[PDB]
Structure 1
Amino acid sequence: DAALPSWMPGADLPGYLNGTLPGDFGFDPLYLGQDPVKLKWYAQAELMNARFAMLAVAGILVPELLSNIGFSWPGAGVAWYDAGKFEYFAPASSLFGVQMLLFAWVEIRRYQDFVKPGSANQDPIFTNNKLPDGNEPGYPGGIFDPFGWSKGDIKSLKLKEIKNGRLAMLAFAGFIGQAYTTGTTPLKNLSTHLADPWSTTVWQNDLARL
């Protein structure tokens, strides 16, 4: 409720979105985050759903971008929905058993940081290595920042992270429906929308399917 940037310029504000959180514009019309015990949860819930989406959209497009150019991979050109049935050195059950133990470390390490910040930065077996104090949940730093960034202008970099993140969550939610309706690779849906942009919107592909 100030001269902050807004999603609808001139609209009234909820009042609790003053600007401490990374990249806010007041967009909460369902009034979901009024309770700060829910807003503190939803802020970290936004970052994790964002960062895994930036991994996802770069993990779908780039193996398709460098395959429709045409490289030589053991998995090349295979669709992101068709990567589950694809075989590897092991069946996918055992792979999922490794994930649910390595992430059961990391997520519980990350959740212990959320319930008390400043009390997770110590290794178990290497008791000299630690992340430097003063960090907030969602931004650990230290070895997580190996290139030496975030030593100045952290607010705009958090704003870039949440804006490059929110575009990715829309893009992966793009990837779900736009590969479920037409059933193609969502890099190749761009090919039809660039072949004839006026003869395939979402509407005409809906109406031809309907």
Structure 2
Amino acid sequence: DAALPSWMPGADLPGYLNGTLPGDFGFDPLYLGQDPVKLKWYAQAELMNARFAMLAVAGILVPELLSNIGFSWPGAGVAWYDAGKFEYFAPASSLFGVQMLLFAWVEIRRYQDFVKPGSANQDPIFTNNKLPDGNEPGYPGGIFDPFGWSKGDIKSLKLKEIKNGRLAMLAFAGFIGQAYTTGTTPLKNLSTHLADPWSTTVWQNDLARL
């Protein structure tokens, strides 16, 4: 109900999306963000899932891209889904326990700062080290931004972050779908589609297996 960009020009978008949240396009046909508290929680959930999917898509695409060139290292020919049954320096259970404890610590710190902004901006061991007073949930800053990149156009940068996060989330969902249907790595499907795009489509692949 404003002049901000929309996902459907002319459509009557809901009134609870006023543009305050980053990447607001008024897309909510199910009206899941009607409740202000639910929307406040969904914003943080979307941001965390976005950054995690960004790291996931980057960690899926970079090793396969580096394996196809002269660059070599121990785990190169292994697929992203086949990395679990790999011979490491420690069993997966021990690593799972270690990461669960570390993630529990950082996630509890983030949750504490989420229920009360600025309540967790102090380093527990060194009292001198701290985060700036001006902070919002989901945007830590301080040591998390050592180069001061947020000091510039934060709105455009936040829009870039949310858009890249949505794109990465869709890409990861596509990775799962392609792995469950084709049963091959994503870059292989990309090259297969690039060789002949007219006969390498989702409709053709699914019709052949029907």
Q: Could you say whether these structures have the same fold, taking a TM-score greater than 0.5 normalized by the shorter chain as the test?
A: yes
Residues 70-92 of structure 1 show CA distances to partners (whole Å, capped at 9, x for unaligned) of 32111112100000011200110
Output the CA distance in 1 between the equivalents of 2:104 and 2:122.
Answer: 17
> 1:13 maps to which residue?
13
- Percent identity between matched residues is 100
Residues 157-208 of structure 1 show CA distances to partners (whole Å, capped at 9, x for unaligned) of 1000000110000000010001110111101100110010000111000001
Output the CA distance in 2 between the equivalents of 1:183 and 1:71.
Answer: 25
- The CA deviation at 1:124 is 1.0
Contact 1:63–1:77 (Cα < 8 Å) also in 2: no
Contact 1:53–1:168 (Cα < 8 Å) also in 2: yes
Output the CA distance in 2 between the equivalents of 1:151 and 1:112.
Answer: 25
Secondary structure (helix, strand or coil) at the match of 2:109 reads helix
Output the CA distance in 2 between the equivalents of 1:64 and 1:43.
Answer: 32
Secondary structure (helix, strand or coil) at the match of 1:150 reads helix
Is the aligned partner of 1:79 residue 2:79?
yes
Residues 38-70 of structure 1 show CA distances to partners (whole Å, capped at 9, x for unaligned) of 000000000011000000000000011111113
Output the CA distance in 2 between the equivalents of 1:162 and 1:86.
Answer: 33
What 5-or-longer segments of structure 2 have no aligned partner? none
Output the CA distance in 2 between the equivalents of 1:209 and 1:95.
Answer: 39
Output the CA distance in 1 between the equivalents of 2:146 and 2:134.
Answer: 17
Residues 121-176 of structure 1 show CA distances to partners (whole Å, capped at 9, x for unaligned) of 11111111111011110100011001111112111110000001100000000100
TM (norm. structure 1) is 0.98
Contact 1:123–1:129 (Cα < 8 Å) also in 2: yes
Output the CA distance in 2 between the equivalents of 1:16 and 1:69.
Answer: 50
Output the CA distance in 2 between the equivalents of 1:67 and 1:23.
Answer: 35
Instruction: Assess, with a 3 A threshold, how the Cα gap between structure 1 residues 140 and 168 changes in structure 2: closer, same or farther.
Output: same
Is the aligned partner of 1:42 residue 2:42?
yes
What 5-or-longer segments of structure 1 have no aligned partner? none
Across the aligned residues of Structure 1 and Structure 2, the Cα RMSD in angstroms comes to: 0.7
Secondary structure (helix, strand or coil) at the match of 2:186 reads coil
Q: Which runs of 4+ in 1 moved over 2 A?
A: none
Output the CA distance in 2 between the equivalents of 1:179 and 1:154.
Answer: 37
Contact 1:53–1:172 (Cα < 8 Å) also in 2: yes
Contact 1:51–1:165 (Cα < 8 Å) also in 2: yes
TM (norm. structure 2) is 0.98
Q: Give the aligned length.
A: 210
Residues 24-46 of structure 1 show CA distances to partners (whole Å, capped at 9, x for unaligned) of 10000000010010000000000
Secondary structure (helix, strand or coil) at the match of 2:150 reads coil
